[PDB]
């Protein structure tokens, strides 16, 4: 088996994507906890897992069709200094993810390749699950203000 | 509920395989037992009941859409005498059915018929796991050769 | 060891009868299932099952003779609509395997070899109970009728 | 009750052949012991034991006839030095084995005593599954080489 | 399937034997524990229902090849005072029944019939099993003693 | 290290010597199970494998001098009708037993292997035992009588 | 009590030569596990802990006879780079304590002394099976080759 290098082409894009979200995840996580505020860290360290869990689906497709996986380039890293920007350029990330994999989709079906196109299929259902997420929770701080949104992720904690 | 004559032949082209599947795996897996390869005996005979249950899949969903099962079909079996030719056997009934899967995916897809063309993508899956296995199985023979290979897949008894 | 070509010809059409009851009682056990006699479905395929378990005992002694069993030839498979039909099918596939069982086993006790003649007797055995519960189902048919017969073998669900 | 002599004489002579089995095969299990083959070892004993299970039957069907059991015989005893001479030694005395006991098996059946063919019966099937083994053994040690063969059945342990 | 008469005569009259040599060992058992006898009753019972399974078996074949079981026929039964006159009687049924399923055994092997040929092997094994226990006790009874043997067999309870 | 062929000649010998009691012990304790001696029959099997045990040990001691086991010769096999026959052999063979692990252990300890001599002592030993209790059961019989001595290992089961 | 001066001088040349062997089996089992040679490695670090059985029972016996132990001598010790060398030398030193404990046996038995030479024979009898074991391995070392026998004790854990 020997996939056409398109397909390849958008598989190894969007390996290096969830490489990127990994790193902003994890480093997004450790700044929240440094701050105080342990129930954010902890969905947000859940979710850098997930990423892990994405990315190795994606080098093990790669790996099948006699390719070369791409561990070497990143795209640009965003850090926000309050809550509300670490939410903001979350749901960048995901809305640049959700277009690639619609694209790749489409053209990864138009060729006869059925499993990378169900492997896309499912990376898209749960983009567009946090997706929804980030933005209830902006919808949330909106409403409530920031002091009083923060004042109920906070604990103690010995 | 009647389904297409063409979509009824392509799911009955595809039991007709797998039955010859069925046949020869189990053949090749009583010979290699015969012989004292222990392993790789109860490894064929997996895929041997894997091949039963997708046979029974595929008779389900010709007889919920109103058509006759054919029973009586059965292409060449092919029999080797030592491991590579097995694994050269089994190579080429793989790469058949995934052709002839694909082929009938496009077309029952284009039909407006969308339980079949999940049926096949799911076999067409599995299909593409098996013969990577073969695959990398032909390789590590390839580099140790057949002595080194074969002392370790053989047992004594209690 | 080497047997005679006789005995291999004997044990090889054996092996071709069973391969064919096997397929035949897997099909009408689906095609009663499909129309919700669930209680004869599970007989049939418990039968099946046994049809398997003497295939494998027949191709084993066939191996330990330094013969080729074969896996490529079959009989004519016999379909039914009704339950009378499928009754009178195995009826008369029972009859013919203990017909062959009968000169074979002779055959085999006069040239010196008797774990052959040991194998078809069991199997001689386990035919003569299944035509006997075939032959009953069949007089109960014939006391009773299709419609009052076929009220005591279907369930609702599960 | 009161024997044939001529079945006696059978009967005896299988027992005779019982017991120098017996005693070749625990010399060979405790030579190869004393050279490091642990699992040939213990595959050896075994079958030295099921040898002593079979002389206690045949002596137990001599006693019933009201004849005299003899443990004063005994055969030449083979040892062999390599692997490949005490398979021969074990293959040449099962090939001995099975040929007397084809013949008694037709002379006491001709003679209206069917319990000892029986016996005969059960001790001529498992003398071929031996014999079935050791050409097995035979043949592997061929492909694979005395060295490498070896490999796979030493270790020290405690 | 419809066997040969022959076979069918046959297996009536060893199911005949069967059903004699049933009633005769559970009278001897009761007439043995009568007299306090206490150990040997145990094992004439376990004879008796031996006898009810080879008889069921026996009825079993029968009604598979589409004959009539006979259950009104009986043969003569044997009722003996002493320990060694039950002992012979129950050896000489023994010797009747072993003749009886050889000569059958031969007959229905040189027919075809192959499944009454094994059950019928397999009743001589069990008859032979019986019958070396028989001469055992008679030889034993002969060696120590009427009223020494008997006294190693008697319980007070 | 290898032995003296003097040391390997009489580990042989009494190699040797074990099979051939291995024989007899076995074939006597199924000769007294055939007759209806049951409680004498389990004591012959358990002594015949005893015998097997230290066959087995000499074979090893042999093997580590780098040395030839002889799996091939036997002494003449007693048989006895009566149980003070049986009994009779089994204490000529222990006898010469005996006599020959004497002069056995004497012989190996004169020449500084003192492994062979613990396991004749050993092997020594457990003769004694063995040939005290026949001699206790001939005692025995000659007390009793053989009739009232065999009313006592008899069971009906 | 006070033994004799030639019966101690024994006992404590086996001691240095059990320290001298506790030593230097424990340096062959860490060279061994260095390298990647786990099963040799755990069963040379048994050996060494036999060993130091050993030296605690000579040392016990010779505290009982009012004697002074010498924990200050020390034998060459010999240290080899492959397997071979390795079992050729515990070969060497098994085979001159092996001659050292016969003739201290003898002597000791000769005078009168015998608790002191039923220890140096069960400390002979563990000698006689350690030696075997080398010579088995050398012997496979010989007949399979260096690379494929240690193909065979390499584990990636
Ligand atoms: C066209 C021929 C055959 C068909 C259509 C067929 C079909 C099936 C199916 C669908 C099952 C379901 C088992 C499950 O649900 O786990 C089954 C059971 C089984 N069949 Fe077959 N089979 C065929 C030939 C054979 C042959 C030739 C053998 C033996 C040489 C065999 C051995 C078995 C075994 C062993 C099982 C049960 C496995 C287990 O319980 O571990 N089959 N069969
Ligand atoms: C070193 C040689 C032998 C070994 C290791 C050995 C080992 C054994 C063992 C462990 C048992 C079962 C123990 C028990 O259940 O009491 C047994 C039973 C038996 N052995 Fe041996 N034995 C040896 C020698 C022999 C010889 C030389 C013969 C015949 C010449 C023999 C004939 C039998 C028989 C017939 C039985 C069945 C015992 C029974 O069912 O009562 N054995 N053997
Ligand atoms: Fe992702
Ligand atoms: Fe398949
Ligand atoms: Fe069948
Ligand atoms: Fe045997
Ligand atoms: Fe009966
Ligand atoms: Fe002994
Ligand atoms: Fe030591
Ligand atoms: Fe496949
Ligand atoms: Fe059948
Ligand atoms: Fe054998
Ligand atoms: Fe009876
Ligand atoms: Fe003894
Ligand atoms: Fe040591």
Request: charged share 30%; hydrophobic share 40%; glycine share 4%.
């Amino acid at each position: 088996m020997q996939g056409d290098p398109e397909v390849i082409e958008f598989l190894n894009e969007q390996l290096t994507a969830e490489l990127t979200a990994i790193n902003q995840y994890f480093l997004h996580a450790k700044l929240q906890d440094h701050k105080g505020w342990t129930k954010l860290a902890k969905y947000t360290r859940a979710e850098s897992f997930d990423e892990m869990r994405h990315a190795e689906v994606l080098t093990d497709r790669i790996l099948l069709l006699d390719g070369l996986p791409n561990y070497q380039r990143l795209f640009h890293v965003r850090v926000g200094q309050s809550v509300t920007e670490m939410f903001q350029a979350d749901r960048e990330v995901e809305l640049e993810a959700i277009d690639r994999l619609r694209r790749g989709i489409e053209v990864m079906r138009a060729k006869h390749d059925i499993t990378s196109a169900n492997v896309f299929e499912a990376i898209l259902a749960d983009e567009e699950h946090h997706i929804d997420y980030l933005e209830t929770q902006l919808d949330l701080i909106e409403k409530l203000g920031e002091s009083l949104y923060l004042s109920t992720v906070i604990e103690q904690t010995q």
